[PDB]
From TrEMBL:
Portion of the parent chain present: 684 to 801 of 808
Family: Belongs to the CELF/BRUNOL family.
Protein name: Testis-specific RNP-type RNA binding protein
Top-level division of the source organism's lineage: Eukaryota
Domain RRM: 41-118
Organism annotation: Drosophila melanogaster
Length: 118
């Protein structure tokens, strides 16, 4: 071939008669919301297990314009539920107000620690 391939997009992987394929686990990096923006309105919270998603916090504070959310799940093996989420606000002080004035994870009995950083 000419040696000119097209990249940038993930293509489908078909199976082959070769059989015997090595399976490996991968940790995708998806951000609860829109791409990154101007920092200064960001918040780091840590209260709940892996079930804590970044999208919930972003949505709540959303006046917090450019919304970039990520999450950090923590469990020793499978049975430990303690964890934190990361959020990144890129907007006027309004996003800042979202962070100081608002906790980020409520569970029937849990409250997330919202630590503000501008």
């Amino acid at each position: 071939a000419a040696g000119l391939p097209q990249f940038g997009s993930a293509s489908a992987l078909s199976t082959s008669p070769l059989a015997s394929v090595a399976l490996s686990a991968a940790a995708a990096a998806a951000a609860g919301k829109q791409i990154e923006g101007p920092e200064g309105c960001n918040l780091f919270i840590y209260h709940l297990p892996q079930e804590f998603t970044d999208t919930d916090l972003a949505s709540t504070f959303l006046p917090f314009g450019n919304v970039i959310s990520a999450k950090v799940f923590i469990d020793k093996q499978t049975s430990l539920s303690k964890c934190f989420g990361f959020v990144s606000f890129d907007n006027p002080d309004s996003a800042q107000v979202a962070i100081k004035a608002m906790n980020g994870f409520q569970v029937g009995t849990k409250r997330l620690k919202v630590q503000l950083k501008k």
